[PDB]
Amino acid sequence: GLTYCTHASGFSFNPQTADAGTSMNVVTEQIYNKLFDIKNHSATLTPMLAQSYSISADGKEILLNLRHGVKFHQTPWFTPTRDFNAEDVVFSINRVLGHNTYRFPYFDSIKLNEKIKSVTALSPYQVKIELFAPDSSILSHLASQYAIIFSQEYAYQLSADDNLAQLDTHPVGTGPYQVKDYVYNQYVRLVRNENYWKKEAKIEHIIVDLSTDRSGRLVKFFNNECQIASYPEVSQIGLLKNDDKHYYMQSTDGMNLAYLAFNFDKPLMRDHEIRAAISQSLNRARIIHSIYHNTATVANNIIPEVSWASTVNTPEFEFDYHPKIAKNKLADKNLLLNLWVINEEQVYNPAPFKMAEMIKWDLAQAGVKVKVRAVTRPFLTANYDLILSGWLAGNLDPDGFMRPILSCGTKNELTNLSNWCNEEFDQFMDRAITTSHLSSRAKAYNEAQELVLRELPIIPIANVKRILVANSRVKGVKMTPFGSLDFSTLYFI
RNA sequence: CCCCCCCCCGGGGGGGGG
RNA sequence: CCCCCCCCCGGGGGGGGG
Ligand code: HEM
């Protein structure tokens, strides 16, 4: 038996209804399968519930050849009568599109229904996707944590009794692990799926512990009630070592960006002169040590270096810390600005309010008055001059993170906190998915990044590392920038 | 119930890359 | 740790014999 301890913050049996850029769902990574997986810095489509695919010459039609003999979980709440087929695929994508099955933040922010025309079953083992125009990002989005396949047989039985809410309370998937029992925001008890379509899970029983706070997580670990500890307290990390023979640490870089956005609804914030000066006033180097204790990189980029689309070696930032230039342009302007901070646990921010004080301090030195406000996620959904946020993405295709944050389509949404719209940026972004090749795609993505780093719609603060601690007994631990953790590969020695 | 071909999975052996 | 070929096992589909 293995125990995985992590935060109750962001816990869901459905990453589709969850707010985008906030989590990597460690639970749905084990109980649900996608059509494809992408687990390499080359973005190679690993076939999962889809054996293979082919794209029409014009680029507007994708055919998915689905795997045979795949069966859904046999749980107390559901007992399947048939194998996985095209009907389960058709139901799952049509739901997020808003089409006949007979708010999805991620899929809304990438505008899937504007990408996809139709998803239809040709054979029981063949699905046809119609596209409005060629999109080289479609299968990467269907390779993401958000594109899990649900049971059509289960949803038909649930819709029979108005019970379709149960889908997210009592799950049924094709994953290597199966849900046994749980208590909300406390624990999840997983059991190995015996009739899995791939190499079977090595550990029969896994418990996902959500109960303990960030501080007492390493406490529970060293008390041996916890064999893998995820997201530990940042100050506690500097107490640990890599020499120890009873525990090891594993870090990973990726798309985990903390940033500051300018509200472009504020006539002052639409001024490039003040935006470039505010950035010059911020000592982002000093923030990385006080907030992240060497578990982050000062970010002068939006696309991480682990992305296939990082062809720029992140050049020197033209609006980096210089308080003398900042003091001149801002003090004489006599500015007072409302800085909002989302009051929640952030994966890109261990201490978001502490950082908001360090920003309030750095800006006062250059003659800017900042008034920080603790704001809730739904209150924001219902005014700020600056907001402190970020993005965590496993999908390292910049269509999945740069489009939600900076595109015109998402301006009046929670994803684009800048309320920015640049038709030249949208130009590069649209171009980057009409071309199918990585050379062509990375060129347009670096052009858009270069535009973002000069127009300054956001100030990138940190390149954050996801950390975990594991016991020496536990082998088969592989932390990747591409997703959560695969519990299938875990085993004791 | 017995026998071919295709696809997929798992295992073992030979070869190739860090 | 990643990738070829051979062999074996299991599963799914098409074909052939009582
Ligand atoms: C490789 C170098 C290792 C050294 C030098 C080492 C040393 C020790 C020491 C000194 C203790 C007593 C507590 C202490 O004062 O540290 C201990 C206990 C223990 N060690 Fe190790 N250890 C090593 C590797 C491992 C590994 C790989 C495991 C995997 C299980 C392991 C499992 C344990 C366990 C479980 C205990 C507690 C008693 C027990 O469970 O049998 N050790 N070891």
Residue numbers in the entry: 35 to 136, 163 to 442, 450 to 560
What's in the article?
Important for NTHi survival, colonization and persistence in vivo is the Sap (sensitivity to antimicrobial peptides) ABC transporter system. This multi-component system uses a periplasmic protein (SapA) to bind and deliver substrates to the heterodimeric inner membrane-associated Sap permease (SapBC). The Sap ABC transporter is completed by two membrane-associated nucleotide-binding proteins (SapD & SapF) that hydrolyze ATP to provide energy for substrate transport across the bacterial inner membrane. The structure confirmed the classification of SapA into the Substrate Binding Protein (SBP) superfamily, as was predicted from sequence analysis.
Hemin was also soaked into SapA crystals. However, the pocket remains too small (approximately 400 Å3) to accommodate a substantial ligand such as heme, which occupies a volume closer to 800 Å3. The bound heme forms a crystal contact between two symmetry-related SapA molecules, each coordinating the ligand via a surface exposed histidine (His 306 in both cases). Although the heme bound in the SapAheme crystal structure is present at a crystal contact, providing a stoichiometry of 0.5, there are no further interactions between the protein molecules. Therefore, there is no reasonable basis to suggest that the 2 SapA:1 heme complex shown in Fig 5B is a physiologically relevant dimer. This surface location is far from the ligand binding cavity and out of the context of any defined pocket and may therefore cast some doubt on the physiological relevance of this interaction. Nevertheless, at the very minimum, we can conclude that a surface residue His 306 has the capacity to coordinate heme to the SapA molecule. It is the first molecular-detail experimental structural evidence for heme binding to SapA or indeed any Cluster C SBP.
